[PDB]
Amino acid sequence: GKKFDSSRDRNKPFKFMLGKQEVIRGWEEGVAQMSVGQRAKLTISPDYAYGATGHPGIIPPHATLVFDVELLKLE
Amino acid sequence: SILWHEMWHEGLEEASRLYFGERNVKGMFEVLEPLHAMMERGPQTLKETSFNQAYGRDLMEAQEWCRKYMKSGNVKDLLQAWDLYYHVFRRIS
Amino acid sequence: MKIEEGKLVIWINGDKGYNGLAEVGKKFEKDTGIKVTVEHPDKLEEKFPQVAATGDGPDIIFWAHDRFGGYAQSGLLAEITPAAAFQDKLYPFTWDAVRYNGKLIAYPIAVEALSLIYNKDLLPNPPKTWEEIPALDKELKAKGKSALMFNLQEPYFTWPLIAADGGYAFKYAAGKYDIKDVGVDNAGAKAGLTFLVDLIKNKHMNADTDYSIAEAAFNKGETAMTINGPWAWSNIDTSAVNYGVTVLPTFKGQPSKPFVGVLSAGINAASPNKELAKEFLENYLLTDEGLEAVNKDKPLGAVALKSYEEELAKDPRIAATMENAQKGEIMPNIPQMSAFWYAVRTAVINAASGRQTVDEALKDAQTNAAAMGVQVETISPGDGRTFPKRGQTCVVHYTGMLE
Ligand SMILES: CO[C@H]1C[C@@H]2CC[C@@H](C)[C@@](O)(O2)C(=O)C(=O)N2CCCC[C@H]2C(=O)O[C@H]([C@H](C)C[C@@H]2CC[C@@H](O)[C@H](OC)C2)CC(=O)[C@H](C)/C=C(\C)[C@@H](O)[C@@H](OC)C(=O)[C@H](C)C[C@H](C)/C=C/C=C/C=C/1C
Ligand SMILES: OC[C@H]1O[C@H](O[C@H]2[C@H](O)[C@@H](O)[C@@H](O)O[C@@H]2CO)[C@H](O)[C@@H](O)[C@@H]1O
């Protein structure tokens, strides 16, 4: 499908705090069940993503998101 | 006694919540605009000068992306701004 | 008002007989003057909960009963209140399939089950076992034919084989489904999926085979066998291919256990025509003449209506379907069926494509079977003892894509 964002295209890794409502619910629970070094493919339902409103310009409504994520390290 | 990093920390904490949580781009610029004009006036304390040295260019570049967004209307430029805003936020936290 | 008042809008899957259902709608319009419109959109089982959330859905929806539990939980369905005399007109077990939290949420129409469909000319005696199919394909390759071609994209068709050796979606306890007791990675499921992958490896089947590919092949007499439901028969009738409907081959001396689906009609909770919908379903569709009209277009299978079923049960094709149905199990109508079906879909596709091993694919599907929101597909494993906890920072690389 259509790539909308990649941290690999920046060359700089992305950081976030878990269980602090910083990211979407798909990540919050999808990453919480990932081990260090693991690369996984998260398929996130709209209800766990951007819902019916979406994110205009990037994400259409009712958009199911696919994330290719590798957990590098914890800090 | 009120510091520059304090104000930028709260400002971004507010602007991100307005755009990503309330989908309010106009309200986001209302909280960001004064903080940039604050840098525009220049640092007057030791702490302010140190802050400006670290994040001055990054924050200045971020505003240029915001201006680019106003003209283009492409949310890509706005995201590029938030990439710079997020970088300075992580350092001041 | 998002939903039009005084008009009935009905959603049914395009594989069913929607023209026959429209003829019923014409009869309803003839008698009442109420326009009935039958639409057959793609992915309607996914579209309904999207549109009905705001109350912009259709009046009536037609799907197998497994979806309906999730719909009922989201409050997208109105509680149907059929008269006690009407309830006795449909077989009692069909009412149980459309009951959720002790409340009827849909009308049962027909009972569906997958069967082995074979060309009588190419193959007089069809195989009684799965294990003898590779040899039969090998023999049939000599005549430029193939043994078996069925849909490998939807996990409805490959479940009988997985369930044959004792693979189960959710364990059935004391009259209740345990969602924490998944059996997709058990020895039985592993054995069943392996045999499926083995067939594809030894070039007995192609992994890119869909419903239409498999349908074209059989109906043109290129393949000897196929696995499909009753709806498909009317296409084969016109294909001029002598065919029989028989029990699905056994695996490891165990009968193939397909998931049994009851075609059900639910009323939108947002519909202003709930009482009109009730009248259409009870007095027009669920009648001898009503079901016949739909049946003539595309066979419904074994219907819920007692009177018409006593006629259809004389058809050996129906008896064959109900033979497989007995060996199989009626689908749970729990909300997690959505998660399950997509979890087994991913695992079957990945294994068939060779993207993952059987053990790898089913390991993912085990934890995904109840995962309503997010589902994880392992690309490469981690240390398996360092999971992040609340309050910690996670340094990750990612890519965002739309499906
Ligand atoms: C160019 O990249 C953008 C993000 C873009 C936006 C558009 C989407 C397609 C996307 O491309 O990311 C995308 O890939 C995506 O959907 N992401 C990013 C990767 C993680 C998963 C997901 C996500 O949750 O995004 C997030 C999503 C868009 C919004 C949030 C979803 C969860 C919900 O609870 C939040 O409400 C509060 C809003 C973005 C983020 O992960 C960022 C880091 C976090 C926030 C903004 C909020 O948590 C905020 O709360 C006020 C904060 O606490 C932060 C730290 C405050 C600081 C100053 C602001 C930082 C802003 C950073 C912006 C960045 C890097
Ligand atoms: O493939 C998973 C799918 O299986 C069932 O859908 C069947 C349906 O019951 C039949 O009537 C016919 O339309 O074929 C479908 C498979 O393509 C489940 O009912 C459904 O929820 C699930 O997604």
Side-chain angles (χ1 to χ4, degrees), chain C residues 13 15-16 45 63-67 112 151 153-157 211 231 261-263 331 337-338 341 345:
Chain C
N13 196 279
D15 75 324
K16 304 299 187 300
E45 75 276 13
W63 197 263
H65 66 282
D66 61 295
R67 272 276 168 182
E112 313 159 348
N151 188 14
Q153 311 309 310
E154 286 289 356
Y156 181 64
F157 300 79
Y211 178 98
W231 50 85
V262 181
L263 189 67
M331 282 195 272
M337 285 307 285
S338 302
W341 276 126
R345 186 186 206 270

Side-chain angles (χ1 to χ4, degrees), chain B residues 21-66:
Chain B
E22 288 180 32
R23 217 70 34 79
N24 188 13
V25 192
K26 213 282 163 191
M28 160 197 154
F29 284 135
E30 280 177 9
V31 61
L32 244 41
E33 182 184 312
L35 289 171
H36 286 287
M38 180 202 207
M39 309 290 285
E40 211 175 69
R41 288 189 290 273
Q44 294 292 326
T45 73
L46 189 146
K47 280 198 179 75
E48 285 183 4
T49 305
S50 289
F51 180 93
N52 197 302
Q53 181 62 40
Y55 320 108
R57 183 184 45 78
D58 288 339
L59 285 168
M60 198 191 74
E61 189 190 322
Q63 187 180 217
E64 193 54 48
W65 284 109
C66 288

